[PDB]
């Protein structure tokens, strides 16, 4: 079993000792060697076990029963500091000192789409065709970046252009081509990459790369499970709240209730005052987790886009189609439909156009071959010119 | 909606105007700088009542710059639209994205998404209009609309109207 | 006349009101959240956004304009950013006052250890100056070493 093995009062104690950084495993090996050497002698090292954890830097934990045993184990070592920096580990901490880590995900799944940390395809989305059993590397499906004779743009490996620019192409199978030492399978590069070269979480996909990857599958973006999970992650993480926001509750006993955010504490507890026909209920403040709150957007409110192609665009709400909200823009003066997850009720725009485009305000520019004008107002997407 | 409000203005006068006609000059300066202006807080100031008998008080000399500062209090007629208000209008332009009406000095834009569906935009009609079987709204046509949202600018106000509810549309 | 024209009216300070900054106000007046310890992005100019040298905080270079106000170096006053703390910590300047406040109130019900029923307590509350008022209230409530769940009738204490 696993539950029954939890420690008791009569179990051997655990001590932690500060040591010099980077020598923890060395101290562990020295302790084991000393225990083995003195095992079977008149004065054996009266300890039971010793270990360390990578996260808990500078600490080595020994399971024993006596402080003299700890002193004897540490006697004759140079990594131990001058002072006896030893402490008694609390019995409750015994389970935590040996609990595992990095259990967020079971494994890297073959066929999943991931981003590359570094290399020539730094940041390019890649499909995990193969996961090596070692777990340190994995073979991936990528879009080649070649010039055929500062990196070239990603493009499917073209055998005809490659032969024209380099007639030394190799062939090993049908559809599997090796050019310049790189193996391209049906126009897609297949190359092993280390685990330290990949981002397996918070992956941001683009429909352009998705289409370029799924075109060979005879269907545009047939696989959408991992994409749906990424959508859920993006929707959940992008939500940020402020006092005074009108929100609705999705779960809990208070489901389908409206309220206004009164105060914000940390990023997971939000104090909300609820609104209802009963006056005595409207005078109560409730702290509610943010994971069960949805923003309420009323028609005719100034709202600013948080994230997306229309970032920093503002307008007035016109149509509320549930998840997707429609609003008339201020700069383009046209209706734009964006999800309610990307909107914040900002009563004032005050948009700054700096660090965008080539021209600033009051710039005398040439409209065309005949018309010359000056800039009166700048936008995130266009400019206004008086000729 | 029109209102009467007691407003105040801070007026700075250059020393070159320190003459016997100081008071009247301040009066015309106030009239030129207030009549017709548009402030988001108040709306539009259309006229100033008793414009020739406004008290200006005693101006204070700004230390280090010589110019005198005057505090002028006056009563003026002010118009400001409110959210959720139904007012009369006259259509000024017809466009596929919607039609623009005028409510006094304010110009209101109504999008197609706030127009009843039966009022299909007819570009072939002369002039082009948003028309139904029994309704035809074109340039110069009286319309009764409800203001839904107001946008505040530096010295301008942008309002959005709707005719999608009852007792609205053509009148 | 050495300053570029601004349409805001020019006035002079008549009162300075002191006080503390609420976390809500700190979050409100901030323009960016500081989270990355690296000062420089990749040591290739353009300091990392979200770091301690975010361009939104303000500009100190002649050829670089502030990304928040758009003004030059001579006009940008600087804009604040905020950093969220994982665990709340003491303000080093208020620890003695925090200790005094802890001595004045109950640690469970969050109420004063004395009430207006005591003539001395009412006399102390009658004073106007906040500092002397706090001093008198502390001098009285310091001796009271136990919360009362009942009137010395329930006074709101937890006992």
């Amino acid at each position: 079993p696993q539950r029954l093995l939890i420690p008791t009062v009569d179990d051997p104690g655990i001590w932690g000792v500060k040591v010099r950084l980077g020598k923890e495993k060395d101290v562990v090996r020295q302790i084991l060697k000393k225990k083995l050497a003195r095992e079977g002698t008149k004065n054996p090292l009266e300890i039971y076990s010793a270990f360390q954890r990578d996260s808990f830097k500078g600490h080595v934990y020994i399971e024993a029963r006596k402080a003299e045993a700890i002193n004897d184990a540490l006697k004759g070592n140079v990594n131990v500091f001058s002072n006896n920096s030893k402490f008694l580990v609390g019995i409750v901490e015994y389970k935590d000192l040996l609990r595992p880590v990095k259990s967020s995900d079971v494994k890297l799944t073959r066929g999943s789409y991931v981003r590359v940390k570094n290399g020539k395809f730094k940041g390019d989305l890649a499909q995990v065709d193969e996961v090596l059993e070692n777990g340190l590397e994995a073979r991936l499906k990528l879009v080649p970046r070649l010039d055929y004779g500062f990196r070239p743009a990603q493009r499917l490996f073209s055998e005809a252009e490659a032969r024209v620019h380099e007639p030394t192409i190799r062939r090993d199978r049908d559809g599997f081509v090796t050019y310049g030492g790189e193996e391209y399978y049906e126009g897609f590069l297949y190359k092993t990459f280390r685990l330290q070269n990949l981002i397996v979480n918070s992956i941001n996909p683009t429909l352009n790369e998705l289409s370029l990857f799924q075109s060979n599958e005879e269907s545009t973006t047939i696989d959408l499970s991992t994409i749906a999970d990424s959508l859920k992650e993006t929707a959940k993480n992008l939500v940020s709240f402020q006092p005074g926001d009108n929100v609705e509750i999705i779960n809990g006993e208070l489901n389908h209730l409206t309220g206004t955010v009164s105060s914000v504490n940390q990023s997971t507890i939000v104090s909300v005052r609820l609104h209802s026909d009963d006056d005595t209920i409207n005078s109560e403040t409730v702290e509610i987790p943010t994971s069960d709150l949805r923003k309420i957007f009323n028609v005719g409110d100034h709202v600013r886009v948080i994230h997306g192609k229309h970032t920093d665009d503002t307008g007035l709400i016109v149509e509320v189609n549930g998840d997707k909200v429609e609003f008339i823009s201020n700069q383009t003066k046209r209706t734009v439909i964006v999800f309610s997850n990307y909107l914040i009720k900002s009563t004032d725009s005050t948009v700054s156009i700096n660090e965008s485009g080539r021209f600033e305000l009051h710039d005398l520019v040439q409209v065309n071959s005949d018309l010359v004008g000056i800039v009166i107002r700048a936008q995130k997407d266009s400019f206004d010119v008086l000729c | 909606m029109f209102f009467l409000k007691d407003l105040s203005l801070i007026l700075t006068l250059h020393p070159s105007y320190f003459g016997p006609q100081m008071n009247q000059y301040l009066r015309e300066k106030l009239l030129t700088d207030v009549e017709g202006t548009c402030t988001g807080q108040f709306g539009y100031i259309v006229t100033v009542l008793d414009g020739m008998n406004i008290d200006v008080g005693k101006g204070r000399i700004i230390p280090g710059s010589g110019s005198a500062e005057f505090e002028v209090k006056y009563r003026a007629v002010v118009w400001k639209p409110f959210k959720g208000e139904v007012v009369d209008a006259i259509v000024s332009n017809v466009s596929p994205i919607g039609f623009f009406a005028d409510v006094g000095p304010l110009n209101v834009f109504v999008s197609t998404r706030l127009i009843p569906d039966n009022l299909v935009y007819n570009p072939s009609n002369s002039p082009p209009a948003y028309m139904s079987n029994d309704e035809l709204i074109t340039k110069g046509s009286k319309v009764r609309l409800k203001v839904v949202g107001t946008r505040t600018d530096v010295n301008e106000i942008y309002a959005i109207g709707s005719i999608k509810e009852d007792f609205l549309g053509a009148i | 006349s050495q300053f570029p024209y601004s349409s805001a009216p020019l006035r002079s300070v008549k009162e300075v009101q002191f006080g503390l900054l609420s976390p809500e106000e700190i979050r409100a007046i901030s323009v960016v959240k500081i989270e990355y310890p690296e000062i420089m992005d990749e040591s290739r100019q353009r300091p990392r956004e979200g770091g301690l040298n975010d361009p939104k905080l303000g500009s100190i270079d002649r050829n670089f304009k502030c990304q928040t106000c758009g003004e030059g170096m001579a006009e940008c006053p600087g804009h604040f950013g905020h950093m969220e703390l994982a665990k709340p910590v003491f303000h080093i300047g208020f620890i003695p006052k925090i200790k005094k406040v802890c001595e004045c109130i109950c640690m469970n019900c969050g109420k004063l250890l004395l009430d207006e029923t005591n003539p001395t307590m009412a006399q102390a509350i009658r004073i106007r100056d906040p500092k002397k008022r706090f001093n008198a209230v502390w001098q009285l409530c310091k001796t009271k070493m136990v919360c009362e769940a009942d009137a010395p009738v329930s006074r709101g204490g937890c006992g």
């Binding site: 009051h362 005398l364 009166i376 107002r377 008086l386 | 530096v154 010295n155 | 024209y5």
Partner: peptide
């Protein structure tokens, strides 16, 4: 012959208005 005059009194187009150089006099 075009000059781009800006005035703080004028509100239209943030005070920017185009006027020919032949129709103005030096102040």
């Amino acid at each position: 012959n075009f000059l781009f005059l800006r005035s703080r009194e004028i509100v239209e187009n943030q005070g920017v208005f185009v006027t020919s150089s032949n129709r103005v006099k030096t102040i």
